[PDB]
C-alpha cells in the first residue's frame, strides 16, 4: 500500500508525509462553497490484492491559515459528510486494487461572516489530512500525512 499525488510526489509502504499543491477558485462569495477536491490529487493502491485487503480512513483533518480563520468547513469522505476540522475518524474505505485510485476526500469551505478580501494567501498551508491504513493480514498501522498548500490567493468580495 502506497500513495502518490498529481504533483508527482509519493509516499511509500509504511507511510510518511508529502506536500499537495492545489489550485483554488480565485473568487468566492459569502454563501458560496470553495471546493478542494483531493480526489483528483491523491491516489493510492494495494500492493498485494491477490492476498491482502487494505483498509483506509481519514483519521483526522486540520485547517490552517485562512481556511481556519475565514471559512466554515465540511469534509466529504466517500459520499459521507463530516465536520471539518474533524471531530472523529471516518469509517474504512476498502482498497483491493493495484491500479492507483483516488483517495475520495473533498473539502467544502464557505466564507464566515467576518471573511472579506484575501481570505486565503498563495503558498500558505491550508490543511493537513491524515490518511490511516491497515489491512486484514497483519499489524500494520500506517499514517500518510498530506500537507495541503494553496497555489493562489482566494478573494471574498465585500
Ligand X SMILES: CCCCCCCO[C@H]1O[C@H](CO)[C@@H](O)[C@H](O)[C@@H]1O
| Residue number of the CB atom closest to ligand X | 1
Q: Which three cell numbers stand for residue 123?
A: 503558498
Specify whether the CB–CB gap between 103 and 56 falls below 8 A: yes
Site string for ligand X, 91-130 (x = CB under 6 A): ----------------------------------------
Nearer to ligand X, 80 or 89 (CB): 89
User: Which residues within the stretch 45-84 sit at the binding site for ligand X (CB under 6 A)?
Assistant: 46-48, 52, 54
Asked if residue 10 binds ligand X (CB under 6 A), the reply is: no
Under 8 Å CB-to-CB from 131, ≥6 apart: which residues? Answer: 3, 42, 44, 56, 57, 58, 59, 103, 143, 144, 145, 146
Q: What is the SS3 string spanning 47-92? A: CCCCCCCEEEEEEEEEECHHHHHHEEEEEEECCEEEEECCCCCCCC
CB of 39 to ligand X, least distance (A): 20
Of 54 and 120, the one with the shorter C-beta distance to ligand X is 54
Interaction residues for ligand X, span 127-156 (CB under 6 A): 135, 137, 140
C-beta of residue 121 within 8 angstroms of C-beta of residue 103? no
- Of 30-38, 40-48, 65-73, 109-117, which segment contacts ligand X by CB under 6 A? 40-48
Pairwise CA distance, residues 108 & 6, whole Å: 20
CB nearer to ligand X: pick between 47 and 153: 47
Task: Write down how long the chain is.
Answer: 158
Give the nearer residue to ligand X in terms of CB position, either 136 or 151.
136
Binding residues vs ligand X (CB under 6 A): 1, 13, 46-48, 52, 54, 135, 137, 140
Amino acid at each position: 500500500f502506497a500513495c502518490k499525488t498529481a504533483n508527482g510526489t509519493a509516499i511509500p509502504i509504511g507511510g510518511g508525509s508529502a506536500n499537495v499543491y492545489v489550485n483554488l477558485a480565485p473568487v468566492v462569495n459569502v454563501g458560496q462553497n470553495l471546493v478542494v477536491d483531493l480526489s483528483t490529487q491523491i491516489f493510492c493502491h494495494n500492493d498485494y490484492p491477490e492476498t491482502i485487503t487494505d483498509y483506509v480512513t481519514l483519521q483526522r483533518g486540520s485547517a490552517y491559515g485562512g481556511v481556519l480563520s475565514n471559512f466554515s468547513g465540511t469534509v466529504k469522505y466517500s459520499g459521507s459528510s463530516y465536520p471539518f476540522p474533524t471531530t472523529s475518524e471516518t469509517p474504512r474505505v476498502v482498497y483491493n486494487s493495484r491500479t492507483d485510485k483516488p483517495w475520495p476526500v473533498a473539502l467544502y469551505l464557505t466564507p464566515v461572516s467576518s471573511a472579506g478580501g484575501v481570505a486565503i494567501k498563495a503558498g500558505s498551508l491550508i490543511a493537513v489530512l491524515i490518511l490511516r491504513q491497515t489491512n486484514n493480514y497483519n499489524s500494520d498501522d500506517f499514517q500518510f500525512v498530506w500537507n495541503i498548500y494553496a497555489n493562489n490567493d482566494v478573494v471574498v468580495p465585500t
